[PDB]
Design a protein around this ligand. Sequence first.
Ligand SMILES: CC(=O)c1sc(CCOP(=O)(O)OP(=O)(O)O)c(C)[n+]1Cc1cnc(C)nc1N
Ligand SMILES: CC(=O)c1sc(CCOP(=O)(O)OP(=O)(O)O)c(C)[n+]1Cc1cnc(C)nc1N
Ligand code: SF4
Ligand code: SF4
Ligand code: SF4
Ligand SMILES: [Mg+2]
Ligand SMILES: [Mg+2]
Lengths: 501, 1165, 167
Amino acid sequence: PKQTLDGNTAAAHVAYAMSEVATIYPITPSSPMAEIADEWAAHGRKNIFGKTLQVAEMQSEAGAAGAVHGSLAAGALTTTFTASQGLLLMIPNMYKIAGELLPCVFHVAARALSTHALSIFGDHADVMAARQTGFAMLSSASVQEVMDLALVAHLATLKARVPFVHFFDGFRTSHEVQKIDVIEYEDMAKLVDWDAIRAFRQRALNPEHPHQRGTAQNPDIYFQSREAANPYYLATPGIVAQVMEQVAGLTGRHYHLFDYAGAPDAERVIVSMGSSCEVIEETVNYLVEKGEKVGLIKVRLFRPFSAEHFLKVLPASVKRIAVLDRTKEPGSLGEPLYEDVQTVLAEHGKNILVVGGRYGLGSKEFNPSMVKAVFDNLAATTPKNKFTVGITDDVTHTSLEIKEHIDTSPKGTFRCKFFGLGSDGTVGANKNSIKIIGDHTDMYAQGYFVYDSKKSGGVTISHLRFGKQPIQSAYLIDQADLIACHNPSYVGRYNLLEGIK
Amino acid sequence: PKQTLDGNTAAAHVAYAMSEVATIYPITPSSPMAEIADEWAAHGRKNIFGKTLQVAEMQSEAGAAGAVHGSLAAGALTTTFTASQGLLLMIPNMYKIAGELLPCVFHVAARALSTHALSIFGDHADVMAARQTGFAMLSSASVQEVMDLALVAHLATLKARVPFVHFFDGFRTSHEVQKIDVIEYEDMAKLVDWDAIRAFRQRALNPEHPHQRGTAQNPDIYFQSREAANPYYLATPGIVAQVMEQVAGLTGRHYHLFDYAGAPDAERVIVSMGSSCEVIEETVNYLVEKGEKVGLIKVRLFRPFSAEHFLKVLPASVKRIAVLDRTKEPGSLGEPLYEDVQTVLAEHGKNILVVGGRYGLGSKEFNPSMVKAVFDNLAATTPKNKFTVGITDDVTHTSLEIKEHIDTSPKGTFRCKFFGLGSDGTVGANKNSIKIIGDHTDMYAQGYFVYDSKKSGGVTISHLRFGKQPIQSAYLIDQADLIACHNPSYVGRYNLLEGIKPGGIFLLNSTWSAEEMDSRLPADMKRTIATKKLKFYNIDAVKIAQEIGLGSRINVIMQTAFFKIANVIPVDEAIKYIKDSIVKTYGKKGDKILNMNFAAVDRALEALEEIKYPASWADAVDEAAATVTEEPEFIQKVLRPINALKGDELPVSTFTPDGVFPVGTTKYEKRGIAVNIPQWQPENCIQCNQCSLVCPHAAIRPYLAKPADLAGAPETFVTKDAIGKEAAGLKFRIQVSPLDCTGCGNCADVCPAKVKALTMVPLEEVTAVEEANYNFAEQLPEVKVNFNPATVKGSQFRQPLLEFSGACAGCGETPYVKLVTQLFGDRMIIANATGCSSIWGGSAPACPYTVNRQGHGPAWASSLFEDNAEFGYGMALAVAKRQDELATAISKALEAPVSAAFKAACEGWLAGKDDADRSREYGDRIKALLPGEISQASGEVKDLLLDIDRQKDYLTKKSIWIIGGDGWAYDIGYGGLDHVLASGANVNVLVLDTEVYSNTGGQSSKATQTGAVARFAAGGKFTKKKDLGLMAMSYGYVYVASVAMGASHSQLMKALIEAEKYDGPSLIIAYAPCINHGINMTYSQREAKKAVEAGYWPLYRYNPQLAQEGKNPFILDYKTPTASFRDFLMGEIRYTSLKEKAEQLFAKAEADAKARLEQYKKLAE
Amino acid sequence: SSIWGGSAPACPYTVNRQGHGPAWASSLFEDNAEFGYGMALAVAKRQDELATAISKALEAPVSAAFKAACEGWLAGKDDADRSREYGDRIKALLPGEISQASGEVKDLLLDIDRQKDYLTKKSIWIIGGDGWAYDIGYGGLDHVLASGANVNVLVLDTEVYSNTGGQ
Ligand SMILES: CC(=O)c1sc(CCOP(=O)(O)OP(=O)(O)O)c(C)[n+]1Cc1cnc(C)nc1N
Ligand SMILES: CC(=O)c1sc(CCOP(=O)(O)OP(=O)(O)O)c(C)[n+]1Cc1cnc(C)nc1N
Ligand code: SF4
Ligand code: SF4
Ligand code: SF4
Ligand SMILES: [Mg+2]
Ligand SMILES: [Mg+2]
């Protein structure tokens, strides 16, 4: 059926169905996932095992991670929801969970890490800090993709014995409201490898067939024992590929480990991950229609990185690639995805000029005008490397210049902005209006809400979109068809009519 | 000046000079860094600021990291030392320290991370996990480089404002002893940028010039503000380069961001980091001299990675590069250093074939034969990529083939191996010998020491090298000029003479004469001695030590024998340095002890006899091997080769992919390390079974048998009639396991009979007799007995399910855990915290937890150090879920066409599934009817019964036990333990309180009492012991009890049974005597009795169930102490070493015991 | 308390007429107790550096009124009222004493002047919510309280995680 949900609810919907235990601890913007999971259990929602999910709150995410390990080692399918500083505290236990090959899915609303300052907003800094734990990592770019790929992870982790981190961009996706196709619990159970679940029960700690796990090992056997898990990681890409075909047969939506979009004879291709893929595909449609030979590679399965599946979707006409990372590793030669892309193309002797950039740190805006700038940098005589997009870096001169402002929104899409006052009901009303249009028309509906740091009396700006075509505009509204101001004080104070058509 | 130090001391030497505050927390192998820094402060060593370093120990590495951040933000130069799991907990704070641009240096003894299994040994896994925090990273390849680059890090961090991680290979460098040039503190201060230090003071938080830091930022400014620190990182490489030139001018030793070594026209180059660079340079010298065009790039500054400084040292003739990473990132396209090299060469259009490999994980050996294999792989037509070196990967075929063995050691280097016993003085003597040669000759000296997982009686192998050229051989000795064996039991057990050079020296400690050599030495050993024409020397050091009066200490005796034959220095000069060192070592001892050690040197020189063997020894033939017993595949293929010191030969296909091991494997060890074993006197025995209760290794147990079962018994299996109405008509015997006994002597001390029924007799005299006795007792059939398990005597008739562990002789921890397995081991799951209890409880490949005749026993798992409570808490949730899934399938069976007897047991199980006895009673009833009921069903009814049969392992109620040490419960895991207790879940927490961090050597804890001296507390702990039991009582629904087995057997029985039956959280804090207290382990049980009788340790039980019955929950089980408080303290070395200021601390300890007793009397009123 | 207390670009903490006021810092959620603990050690270290330079001034040729305030401060550096009293006496005599000195005496006085912002005893305050003190930071708060350091922990108990919506 069609419902209007956000990324958090889409993830919790699948996680609730596929899990018996969920140990949680609150952290923005992942706490809504655990909040709605608690309400569902209190109202008696059943999972695919016919029981309600048992939710246990710990004293910290470190305690949550330890509880997950114990619950998994004792024979219960367990998940958790976390982000940012919370994900860091779980990293020590993640090494154990991956090393012991326990099926598991962590759902992460990717959020910036506290460095020079705290930021509750979204980027991939937290997920990248765990890329060496041995967990698999799956990225969803839209609310619909959160629903589908969360199922992909839960099905694949049982088959591969490799735990998964399913992550989506904080706020930009976790709090983005969209009308999506919801997968029924009965349909999931038809795809589950029940043989894998029963095998997972036999490996559990039990006094009637006891075993020892987590021993201490000397140099004589530690190296070999660490390489004994090599077959499990080599087979994980093929398992994810086959699971993605199962979801394809059920939903009609085809995912691959790496997806390509754009001109088949493209010469400039952007490689990206997360919600940026939507903005880039929307821009690619606009540029390809304008005749430019550009393309986009969406990274779905980031770890383990399958070179075979990446090169299969890379056009032979590609001469220049720009890799965008939603993180910053100070002093590093490059960001994680840029180093991976540069490596695989080097291992296969591809004469492709690769350039890396950074974008969207702490939910910095990333709109189609910036995407064209990334493509324009690839078209320059000497493309700037190690760049930034979305800021003006007048100190180190890494920022790309936003030359012109373009409108790539598909024709027929309605766009509204609502300037409201803190807790006056505007946001709640817009949420209800999206549910109204989504339930009663064929139009796709999208809602995103800008909040203020002030707890009382702050300004709220709602961005709503409706159209006959799927809404890939994961960015603030550029040209609004309607602008509503619910507070007369804003007149003469803010540029309300900004960008109005 | 030249001193012999290890990497840890070299690092702490520089860190102490440059820092004002040092917040630390112990973790192997980094804890020696903080230990030596605390001692220097206790003796008043001044830093470059004219003050002593302030050392503060925190509750965890997370707390230490926060303290570093606060100390820096407030204006004090601060450092810390950590590694491995400890570094992981600091990662969140590292982002802040780097983000705020605070000068700082973390010293890391790089150690493996706990994945499928724990490893305390060295690799770069921990450092690589922090490569994105924004810290700089500096690598040291040798002990000398630790000294130099630590200074580079401390100097650069002030100039660049970017904090540094200075890391070196754990053990391979941190514990390698080398003679190095030590930099004087006065010379360092002449290089410090004092202007930079004063600028750091102005940025400090101060109310007279206040500022705000660590704000929360919205998307509008967060991206820009993060990029504002870019110039500081862009300038850091150049700053380190200039700082490296400063150290170069002072020391003459030239470092660069990346260093090159090898042929200038090389075509094959290895890029590496850490101690591997030493092995590679040594191999490169060997290959370049042979004409091969190879080279090596050493990475010093890993982050920030300067492409300019890397390409500057890459010869233009390089065509192929192999990058070696000392880490593993599963599923990644490549390891971190490989990805960096591949990236930078691509950014500059260099057409260079790059290949990456992994090596040395968890201190895996990495020797020159492997280095050539890496170089040979570059010479192949198609070089293998993503490879491994040092293992045989027969599953995924990533390992490189070690074709041939080469000797790249520089000519003139002497090489020695020393096989010793645990704590017999061998390692300490070799350390003294290295200091002697380094201080008195021009030779470089190196020492590396291989230890065992067994805590007592383990094998130690020392690797020493001396030469006229610098020693770059950062690997175990391959071809030894001299081999010494300090334990004759190793003869015929380990391959001692492996790789010994022709004409080398073999030194043996034994009582065997030249004629007995024909019959005592094995044929293969005699063949090697004769064919290689070895100079075989022998000495009876034990006879000498007995005659002199030194007991069995042979460290001085064997050290004298070494210098006499090694010909490393003049023999006359060596004798002087030994006696001079004896005064330094035994100067504080009595005058009688001094002359005894002098006589050891004199008598040893005349007693060392060379064995002139016949040339016919080369033709000796092995004796016919006996018919080998059919052992399990795991024992045959895994445990035996590992214990035979051949674990490195086991291929990848040997091990499970998830680090899961079988149980009950320590019964196959039979080490037989005891000097004395108890002999049972049947006529004095009252059949009390207390000896089986107190045995720290379960080597002594009572055996019952019907008189008919004693048919084929040997004549020495003397028995007595069984006392008690339950054992009427049965025979009784107290039998000891000779090969598993440790000789601790606790059982002889606890025997309360009028005449002692246990006397310690030497093993060799009774070994043949007692072996046949134990082998017969083990084959006795099971005996059903109705003794009450709630008594001491009745409980010991149940089979112990924790046996033959690696704990020390007389350990105070294992008797507690052994008792739990005898009461509830049939149905318990153990979540064990990292520590001693996890080392003797779970060191691969031996598992001390075993099963009974039915095959049931405790399932054991260890997660991490800080998460043990939540680890067991999650297990309880899952077990409850697994029982819930079974109860649903059983309730559906009630509506199914099944037997009426089946329904009766199912309804009975559903009503009592939460009771231990009732669930086992009705659960076993269901198990008996299951096979027949399935046979009588078909279709859907059979499927419903088959699902119940699939879950029959959850019928019996489980008992979750959370076992851990005092360091876990009082410090790092207290926040998690507090949460698990407050939840109210049916869990049982057992705190083995040793009042120290016992495994890591005995460091200070919150469980340490006032005035006790331990590591990190050289001057004694001022603050009193934290009362963990009192805080758990504040909830009111948490069962808390303080027990001590040595004090009261009946009090321990009552608290354990009450704690397990309580449907809620239970906390058992047990006093466990340990060797770190400095006491005779023979009287370990007696020491616990004196502790409670003197008011030092309280005995109480807080029962929440008594509150529901209207009674007082607090019961004080020992109200009036009868012994003297100060007299108990003087019986343990951990308090006498403080004596001065000691009398001030002793008065506080006695006053707190009276106030604690008076506080318990008010609660009991 | 960190959101209304430290959200850029607005700072609610201000200074008095003399320009002095609270310095505010936030590290992480779990480390706040140990964070302030490290600050206490550093300030103690900074006061020792100033007190050492003052002890050298006792042996230096300076005015008797300058020595009188220094002896009084050294006796009362650990009292809030006494350290501010004699500290301001040192501040008033510092500019004139530097004018009357030369050579090494001037450098010794300039070292006192460089550290005059540590004459007044500081008051370390550890501020946090109930979630920090009761949950994630309790293990660290337990340790800092057990150390005995002169720190002031203020637990603003709202009985919930107020900022994140009331958990
Ligand atoms: C094994 C290891 O790496 C140990 S054992 C131990 C303390 C054990 O003391 P405890 O009192 O808790 O138990 P006990 O040994 O019986 O006395 C530490 C700190 N470590 C190092 C360490 C540090 N920090 C973390 C997170 N994990 C580990 N393993
Ligand atoms: C801001 C943020 O991300 C907050 S504020 C907060 C609890 C605040 O409750 P408290 O009672 O301690 O104080 P109060 O707000 O005044 O009620 C949490 C859990 N978080 C998420 C979180 C989770 N885990 C970690 C390590 N850090 C953070 N910041
Ligand atoms: S001497 Fe010690 S190890 Fe041996 S049986 Fe007695 S208590 Fe056990
Ligand atoms: S302690 Fe002594 S009396 Fe008691 S069972 Fe053992 S040998 Fe017999
Ligand atoms: S607790 Fe003490 S006696 Fe027991 S094994 Fe550890 S170090 Fe040895
Ligand atoms: Mg301990
Ligand atoms: Mg609160």
